Amino acid sequence: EEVIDFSKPFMSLGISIMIKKPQKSKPGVFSFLDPLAYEIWMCIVFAYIGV
Amino acid sequence: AFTFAAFCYMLTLVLCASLIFFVIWHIIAFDELRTDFKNPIDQGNPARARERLKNIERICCL
């Protein structure tokens, strides 16, 4: 701008983050526990013990 | 809010009543043992000696 003259921006932008699209993750061993949180499983174990 | 630790505390609270019951039973049995001990331990009667011995053995087994 010190040596030329600009116009008002015709397109405003900024820095941003590019990532690879999340894919269907390869199922993990012990993915059969995913429907319930770990805390539920531990409470189940200790309720079994207590009962 | 409800969590794993709170459930552990609830279960331990329920199970500590059992420990209270056990210790109360202990002290009652030992009070009976003291009533037998501090009381005269004469075993002149064979039947009385046998009864006292079997009571002691039963309480020990319990």
Side-chain angles (χ1 to χ4, degrees), chain A, chain B residues 1-30 33-34 36-37 40 44 46-47 49 53-55 57-62:
Chain A
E1 193 91 26
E2 296 166 329
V3 302
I4 58 159
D5 291 331
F6 276 95
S7 74
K8 301 284 161 280
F10 63 92
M11 201 185 48
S12 287
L13 79 167
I15 292 161
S16 82
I17 309 165
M18 185 180 288
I19 52 153
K20 190 182 197 324
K21 302 171 81 77
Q23 272 152 305
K24 182 62 175 88
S25 66
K26 203 260 187 168
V29 182
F30 313 119
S31 63
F32 65 84
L33 315 164
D34 288 351
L36 310 169
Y38 288 126
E39 65 182 0
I40 294 187
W41 287 114
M42 314 273 287
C43 286
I44 281 167
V45 172
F46 286 123
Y48 168 66
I49 305 302
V51 169
Chain B
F2 192 58
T3 178
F4 180 29
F7 178 72
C8 285
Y9 285 123
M10 281 155 228
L11 203 64
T12 57
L13 187 87
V14 159
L15 287 170
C16 182
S18 58
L19 309 188
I20 289 166
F21 178 81
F22 291 176
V23 300
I24 281 177
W25 206 340
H26 279 112
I27 70 172
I28 276 169
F30 279 116
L33 285 158
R34 272 262 194 100
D36 205 13
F37 167 87
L53 177 56
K54 295 299 185 183
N55 183 274
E57 182 61 24
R58 199 183 46 72
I59 299 298
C60 180
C61 172
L62 177 80

